[PDB]
Amino acid sequence: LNDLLICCRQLEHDRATERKKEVEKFKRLIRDPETIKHLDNWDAVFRFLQKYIQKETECQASRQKKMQEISSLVKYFIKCANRRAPRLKCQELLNYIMDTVKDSSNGAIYGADCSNILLKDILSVRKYWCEISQQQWLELFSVYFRLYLKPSQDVHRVLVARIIHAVTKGCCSQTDGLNSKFLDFFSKAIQCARQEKSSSGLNHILAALTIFLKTLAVNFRIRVCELGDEILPTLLYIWTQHRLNDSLKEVIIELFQLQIYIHHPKGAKTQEKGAYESTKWRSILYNLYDLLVNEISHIGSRRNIAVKENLIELMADICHQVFNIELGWEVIKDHLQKSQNDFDLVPWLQIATQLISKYPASLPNCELSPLLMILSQLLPQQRHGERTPYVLRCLTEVALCQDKRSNLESSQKSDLLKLWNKIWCITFRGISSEQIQAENFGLLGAIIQGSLVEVDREFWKLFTGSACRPSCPAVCCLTLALTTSIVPGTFSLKESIMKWLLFYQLTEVPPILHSNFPHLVLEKILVSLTMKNCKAAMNFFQSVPECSFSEVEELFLQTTFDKMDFLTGFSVHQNLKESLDRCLLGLSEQLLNNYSSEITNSETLVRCSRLLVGVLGCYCYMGVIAEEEAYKSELFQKAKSLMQCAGESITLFKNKTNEEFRIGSLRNMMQLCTRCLSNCTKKSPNKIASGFFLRLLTSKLMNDIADICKSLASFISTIGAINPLAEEYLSKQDLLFLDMLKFLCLCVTTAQTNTVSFRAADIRRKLLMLIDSSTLEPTKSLHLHMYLMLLKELPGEEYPLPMEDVLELLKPLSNVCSLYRRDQDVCKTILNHVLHVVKNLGQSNMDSENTRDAQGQFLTVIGAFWHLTKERKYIFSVRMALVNCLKTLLEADPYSKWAILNVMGKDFPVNEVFTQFLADNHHQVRMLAAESINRLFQDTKLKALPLKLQQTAFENAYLKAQEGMREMETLDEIYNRKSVLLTLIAVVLSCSPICEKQALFALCKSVKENGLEPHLVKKVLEKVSETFGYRRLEDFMASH
């Protein structure tokens, strides 16, 4: 250390001639013992190189070799320093990168080189990705974008654009985001891109622009709307005059799709429905439509003649907005009729398919019939063509759209029935074609479900003999046929179908086991067939209940108040039942006889067990078979043998961990097993089938799975830095290990309901030591994944966990959050996963010493997060997470008996803290608190709260909203603040009849004081009056 520093100082103090060889001496001076003792610093050697560079640059074209040499020298030094861990501080390195490229004295190759190390090291490491401050991000974006705007054009312009893309992503993901005043910079770049033809970095500039609009979509919506009206005409000109680069076209389409989503949130058409309308936008949309109509007739727009999905989706969105120069379905019909080749016909068929699917109301019922003749005419060609699946899909969508309408006339309905009968006749022949099997069965199922064509005796022959193989679309059509029709008795037809479904070749696995099927579909079909009235069982079986920019669009509708979530015993045939039981045991016996310990697949055996427990679950759901006799039934006896045979594969893998080919099979094993279980507590065949599967599992199998869990737990391009929670850090073993652990997690929570052979306590205890402080390493990407999912799956509100388990579960939470404090994405994920603990922490029945310990441990980390959030250290995404988890705290303890967080020695109630977020700086946070404020007026466990508590909660919320109003171009913010206040009042009025009079008076005062929109408030009061039950608004006004 001291000797190295002395040698470096002597070399630095030496003359230039001695420095010629001292550079190599210093480079070779580094050694393994030197780096080991140097770890702490690196700033000392860094500034020695800093002044060495600044001294050398002071003293023609001959210097172009020296500047390249020193650039390589610093590249090697930085790589060696950061090879193991990033000890070097990003701050001083960033400033040097700033000042080496700001000046024009340095060569172009040097700034290009300096940008290379900057991207490959600073922006490729998560540590530097988080520690770069907001001020650094803005200055980092500004200097390189001006360099991009510089008139000099070189090969490095692509690299500079890649820097700009990475900086924009970093600022929009790690900080609060750069100001909207930089939008003029992008406008100038687009204007410059209009003149220049090279467009070297236009792909990254537009992609960075797309990210900025996505991040800046919550606020300044009109400003984004106005800028869209400015750049889109230039983008249309760029598209026409460019060479049509595939990557540039894709990002342009993404920008166009983002603009339409902003202007028309979730397909809004009129201005009063939440859409934004202007003359420039209408002309732009018409001009945008003309370009895409021209572009579809191109070879590169798609051997494959299918137009890309993004084009199809963008096509339907534009058509829906422009449908009412005159435009409509007439041009679509003309194109379909006049198209003689599938090249110019498949795109339009895909266009109509997506428009009908996305917007059922976009197609008038008058044009429904003319489209039906066109589709029928395009169906037959005496053979099978490329357009056939497309014609089948749109016909299915037409049938689905037809079934959703009840205003059709009698004459129109009769014409449609005759047309659909003709459609059914055409599509029935040629069913043997396997290529269009999925589309044909889907069309038949849709027609059968809608009762468009009456079923005939010939259709029932399809599921007989070897006419067709058991497939998912075939079963989906069959279950709809059994639901809306009665099986003819041609004891024979029902028997024949059950042979076809359970046809096993006397070494090929049956297709039902070979291919995955939706849970409890074949089982319900079989049970319904065996009992007296197959139609009745389907109706009763289906009667049971079941367990991006979209969030931004939902925000706009709630902003415009067009969307508001609030204020809104049987008999069985004995012969058929015995026949099915004989077939199930016969199929199972065949599987065991053909089973081998090495070559036979295991997921087929579990699928057979899933089918076997499914029919038993369906049988136990009715009064035909009780649970007690189902346990001793020969089916259940075959069930345990299937798993026991499949259990040895896990046992073998427990010893042969190094095997990799087994991983793919075992990963499929849990996916079947995990989906077998059902955590929902309602009485349903899914719950009964899950209970049978739980009772199947033995004590030997859990220990093998747990032992494999313990064994694998001890093992050891992208624009910017890689998220530590990304799936690319998870290998096959890592992905596998997360799989059965989730299977173990679901087993523990749901096994206690029934009586099982295995002890769930032992698994849970073993799971606790899996995150033991000595063993668990939060810095490891794998170890982070388990603790997050264990925090998500183990807690359960129904039956509280052993309360010593949760404190051990919550023990590493403080350490994990402290290590990942600077990572916004990890903090948001941790907060979203920790809220599941509150459902068990709320119940204070066993209020003991350790009970108050776990509550204190949970409250201090939440209080630290709230304090750190108040210090402006978290992004908006974390702010919802803090709001969301605190909402669960409010739900768990409405009276705040124990939910009191302590910070700097001061106690802050949870209820009082929630009202603070109503005056936040992010528009998305404000309504989420405004929508979730209803927890302060009702128990949410629907009993009301005490009068005094309700009065002070409403008063505190109203004054905070008023404070947010008064702490104020600005029109967007003004409209944003008004929407939150109106949403706050509307929610209070709906959920709090106690404060109905006070809230109404508060709105009345706010009309003249806060300047609320008279039309917006009038619509709200009409809606709540409709919700309450008042026929007219005047009566509900007159009541108060």
Cα separation, 571 vs 532, whole angstroms: 6
Cα separation, 96 vs 78, whole angstroms: 13
Q: For helices 923-932 and 876-892, give the axis angle rounded to 10 degrees.
A: 10
Cα separation, 702 vs 759, whole angstroms: 9
Cα separation, 945 vs 955, whole angstroms: 15
| SS3 of residue 472 by DSSP | helix
Cα separation, 762 vs 707, whole angstroms: 12
Q: What is the DSSP letter of 130?
A: H
**Breaks in the chain after residues, C-to-N cutoff 2.5 Å:** 40, 59, 302, 324, 490, 506, 547, 568, 716, 941, 968
| SS3 of residue 948 by DSSP | helix
Nearest to 133 by CA among 899, 683, 825, 873: 873
Q: What are phi and psi of 900, to 5 degrees?
A: -130, 120
Q: How far apart are the first and last CA of the chain?
A: 83
With beta carbons less than 8 A apart as the criterion, state whether 327 and 288 touch. Answer: no
Q: Which helix (H) or strand (E) holds 109?
A: helix 108-117
Cα separation, 275 vs 406, whole angstroms: 28
How many other β-carbons are positioned within 10 Å of the β-carbon of residue 944?
15
| SS3 of residue 51 by DSSP | helix
What dihedral do alpha carbons 956, 957, 958, 964 form, nearest 10°?
110
- Could you tell me which residues are beta bridge partners of residue 531? 572
The tokens of 821 are what?
Answer: 């404090």
Cα separation, 365 vs 1039, whole angstroms: 44
For 625, residues 6+ apart whose C-beta sits below 8 A from its C-beta are 616, 619, 633
With beta carbons less than 8 A apart as the criterion, state whether 600 and 608 touch. Answer: no
Cα separation, 8 vs 523, whole angstroms: 79
Q: Which amino acid is at 508?
A: E
Nearest to 989 by CA among 928, 933, 914: 933
With beta carbons less than 8 A apart as the criterion, state whether 825 and 878 touch. Answer: no
- E-strand stretches of 770-809: none
With beta carbons less than 8 A apart as the criterion, state whether 525 and 475 touch. Answer: yes
Cα separation, 122 vs 128, whole angstroms: 6
Cα separation, 662 vs 123, whole angstroms: 38
With beta carbons less than 8 A apart as the criterion, state whether 906 and 886 touch. Answer: no
Nearest to 188 by CA among 218, 159, 209, 165: 209
Q: What are phi and psi of 531, to 5 degrees?
A: -90, 180
Cα separation, 197 vs 241, whole angstroms: 9
Query: What's the Cα-to-Cα distance from 872 to each of 140, 830, 867, rounded to whole Å?
Result: 21, 19, 9
With beta carbons less than 8 A apart as the criterion, state whether 591 and 604 touch. Answer: yes
Q: What are phi and psi of 516, to 5 degrees?
A: -70, 145
With beta carbons less than 8 A apart as the criterion, state whether 398 and 378 touch. Answer: no
Cα separation, 640 vs 695, whole angstroms: 9
**Cα 313–chain centre separation:** 19
The tokens of 914 are what?
Answer: 């929630």
What dihedral do alpha carbons 934, 935, 941, 947 form, nearest 10°?
-90
**Cα 1016–chain centre separation:** 33
Q: For helices 699-712 and 732-751, give the axis angle rounded to 10 degrees.
A: 140
What resolution in angstroms does the PDB record give?
2.6
With beta carbons less than 8 A apart as the criterion, state whether 602 and 665 touch. Answer: yes
Nearest to 988 by CA among 980, 996, 997: 996
With beta carbons less than 8 A apart as the criterion, state whether 165 and 207 touch. Answer: yes
Q: Which amino acid is at 304?
A: N
Query: What's the Cα-to-Cα distance from 26 to each of 15, 22, 41, 93, 266, rounded to whole Å?
Result: 15, 6, 16, 20, 63
797-801 LR contacts (CB < 8 Å, sep 24+): 797/839, 797/840, 798/681, 799/752, 800/840, 800/843, 800/845, 801/840
Q: What are phi and psi of 554, to 5 degrees?
A: -60, -30
With beta carbons less than 8 A apart as the criterion, state whether 523 and 615 touch. Answer: yes
306-312 LR contacts (CB < 8 Å, sep 24+): 306/346, 306/350, 307/346, 307/347, 307/350, 310/250, 310/253, 310/254, 310/257, 311/253, 312/347, 312/350, 312/351, 312/353, 312/354
Helices (H), 297-341: 309-322, 329-338
Q: What are phi and psi of 913, to 5 degrees?
A: -65, -35
For 707, residues 6+ apart whose C-beta sits below 8 A from its C-beta are 654
HSE of 768, CA atoms in CB hemisphere, 13 A: 18
Cα separation, 383 vs 33, whole angstroms: 78
Q: Which residue's entry shows tokens 């060609």?
A: 381
224-229 LR contacts (CB < 8 Å, sep 24+): 224/262, 225/262, 225/263, 225/276, 225/278, 225/281, 227/183, 227/187, 228/259, 228/262, 228/263, 228/281, 228/284, 229/278, 229/280, 229/281, 229/284
Cα separation, 462 vs 445, whole angstroms: 13
Query: What's the Cα-to-Cα distance from 670 to each of 140, 376, 602, 616, 763, rounded to whole Å?
Result: 47, 46, 11, 21, 17
How many other β-carbons are positioned within 10 Å of the β-carbon of residue 108?
13
Residue 66 falls in which region: left (phi positive, over 0), alpha (psi -120 to 50) or beta: alpha
Please calculate the CA angle 665-669-671 and round it to the nearest 5 degrees. Answer: 120
Please calculate the CA angle 766-767-769 and round it to the nearest 5 degrees. Answer: 65
With beta carbons less than 8 A apart as the criterion, state whether 537 and 528 touch. Answer: yes
How many other β-carbons are positioned within 10 Å of the β-carbon of residue 642?
24
- Could you tell me which residues are beta bridge partners of residue 909? 900
Query: What's the Cα-to-Cα distance from 950 to each of 299, 786, 938, 1003, rounded to whole Å?
Result: 66, 41, 9, 17
Cα separation, 176 vs 174, whole angstroms: 7
The tokens of 413 are what?
Answer: 């309905």
For 756, residues 6+ apart whose C-beta sits below 8 A from its C-beta are 694, 695, 697
Cα separation, 842 vs 125, whole angstroms: 40
With beta carbons less than 8 A apart as the criterion, state whether 318 and 356 touch. Answer: no
Helices (H) and strands (E) in the chain, counts: 52, 2
The tokens of 447 are what?
Answer: 């027609």
Q: Which amino acid is at 678?
A: S
With beta carbons less than 8 A apart as the criterion, state whether 115 and 159 touch. Answer: yes
Q: Which residue's entry shows tokens 């002395």?
A: 6
Cα separation, 516 vs 890, whole angstroms: 42
Q: Which helix (H) or strand (E) holds 901?
A: strand 900-903
Q: What are phi and psi of 572, to 5 degrees?
A: -125, 145
How many other β-carbons are positioned within 10 Å of the β-carbon of residue 425?
11
With beta carbons less than 8 A apart as the criterion, state whether 168 and 141 touch. Answer: yes
Q: Which amino acid is at 64?
A: Q
Cα separation, 665 vs 925, whole angstroms: 44
Q: Which amino acid is at 36?
A: I
Cα separation, 1000 vs 1039, whole angstroms: 11
For 859, residues 6+ apart whose C-beta sits below 8 A from its C-beta are 899, 900, 901, 902
The total number of residues shown for the chain amounts to 1040
DSSP class per residue in 343-382 = HHHHHHHHHHHHHHHH-GGGS-STTHHHHHHHHHHHS--S
Nearest to 932 by CA among 993, 982, 887: 887
Q: For helices 472-483 and 437-449, give the axis angle rounded to 10 degrees.
A: 10
The tokens of 631 are what?
Answer: 């346990």
